[PDB]
């Protein structure tokens, strides 16, 4: 008997189903660590991360909401992206789009 205990049924949850995704090899050329959030518009991340910015347009990381992917200096890794939904209008970040797409 543990007060307020959960009884979670076993299994798994599939995230962001039915949406376009792509994989991109990313590399941190900066000398300081960089950590990216789940919903941050990837194409506008820190300029020290080298990758095909053209492919990541309108995409975000395909990771559980609220989590992040860290890149230590010199770190190189392949990440999976998932397309933004809703109106697909990007406002903010580095201010590179500030509009639909």
């Amino acid at each position: 008997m543990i007060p307020g205990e959960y009884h979670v049924k076993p299994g798994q949850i599939a995230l962001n189903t039915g949406r376009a995704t792509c994989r991109v090899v990313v590399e941190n050329h900066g000398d300081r660590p960089i950590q990216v959030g789940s919903h941050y518009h990837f194409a506008e991340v820190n300029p020290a991360l080298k990758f095909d910015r053209q492919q990541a347009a309108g995409y975000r990381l395909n990771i559980p909401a609220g989590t992040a992917v860290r890149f230590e200096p010199g770190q190189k890794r392949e990440v999976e992206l998932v397309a933004f939904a809703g109106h697909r209008a990007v406002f903010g970040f580095r201010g590179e789009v500030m509009g639909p797409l």
Partner: protein
Amino acid sequence: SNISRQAYADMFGPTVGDKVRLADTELWIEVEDDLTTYGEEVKFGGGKVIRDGMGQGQMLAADCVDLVLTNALIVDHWGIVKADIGVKDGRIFAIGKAGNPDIQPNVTIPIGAATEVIAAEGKIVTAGGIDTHIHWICPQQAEEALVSGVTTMVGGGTGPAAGTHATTCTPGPWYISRMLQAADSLPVNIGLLGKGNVSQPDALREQVAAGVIGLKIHEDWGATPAAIDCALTVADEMDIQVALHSDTLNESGFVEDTLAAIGGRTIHTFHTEGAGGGHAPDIITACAHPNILPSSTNPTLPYTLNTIDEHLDMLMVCAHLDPDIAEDVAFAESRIRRETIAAEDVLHDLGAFSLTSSDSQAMGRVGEVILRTWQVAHRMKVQRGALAEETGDNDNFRVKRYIAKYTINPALTHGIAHEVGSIEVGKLADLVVWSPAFFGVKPATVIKGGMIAIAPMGDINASIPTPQPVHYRPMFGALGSARHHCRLTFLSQAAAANGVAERLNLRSAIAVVKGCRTVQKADMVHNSLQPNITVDAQTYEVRVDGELITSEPADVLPMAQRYFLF
């Protein structure tokens, strides 16, 4: 990607199919639905979702909510579902999927620059409790009730005076006006009850015109057929509720005579079991009538081993009785009956009794209305098993039936359900946030009108809000004008029309009661049973359709010694 159900639970709280035990009871709820889109849940923090251009949009204040309760597990009379709660203008705006429409799918609750966030993942959110049997013996009762999760208090009194010690009545225009002014200082919604014991209609109309939302008929002021008839007549013409505490001595007649005087007109019977007052020994039979809205007071809930012993002595100090005077003690034994005390618990489980209240400082515990309602649920599950209405391997229906007893049902009974009583869009944002381990016992947050009014708070000089000592302290929603703006003083339609709020210069928001005469037993959510109940005049045995209704006294209960320091 993919995430296991356990990690998911730990991150966003339980989802469809997962069960959670309520506090240390044997009650288990199961998430019936989840309104989110997996992978699109909103979470607050560094690097999390609710940030500019991401889970937070570019809309102006008018186009987004003021407060958002993320990943909440709602427990209400209508469902036990996972969803986000949006609050706007102090009222429940929506129950859906919060986020930014610019980049997220299925957003029904927009988050913007003007949105504050309360993280409810892993928490249970419920409406604020509503106690309709308050004795205004002291103002300190409000904080006590608020801390327990009760956001609305209806009753009567003028302070620690003999009349109030015994009855829920704010006698006349002067005391009503004074108490209405004092109500602005309290952090809970308030409605007042006047003294309804009079055989002259005008003496009642004045009180209603003065501001009361109901009248209390109490035997200590004479609960005679003439008084009852008079109160119900004015109640019928002014759209206010009548609360009854009948003639225990059977002086003017038996239960059947009182029922006759009522004549099928709407009436809320206080402590229907009878220990707290009423015709000896069959006042309990009232629960069988369609016009009676029956409630229990809390010291008899649930039936335990120390119940009877404690009661004989409590019933003395309250009614202003004398142990030496035989007549003052002879009815004590006629008023406290093990037989009806045990049947009461069962009657709640069946939906025969529809409300729970306290009877604050007059044979009731103001801070234990929620606590005791769940203790009865636990005990009934333990003894009677699953309810005929249960579906699935959970106690979801029993939970909906019992939570309705101190939320929506009390609101319907007193004509305030248009403002409070449940989590439904348009209703005042009186919400309580609980941690599953402390459900029903100690709230994590108590929200009034869209502002946190009281919450546990640690060392004020600490580097974070969590260090010890942690005890409940008043927040901004309980301060001066912010409080006035987040609380409601309920007036009668007559008082409202007469300009009472302006005349007394009341500072809080004003609400008006309506629909007090049209509610009937059939309108009590999940608790509309009208049993063919009988009480044996000699053995005091309670019977429904001939079968004996009874239960065994508990020796130990959950939500007791594990949580309290004293």
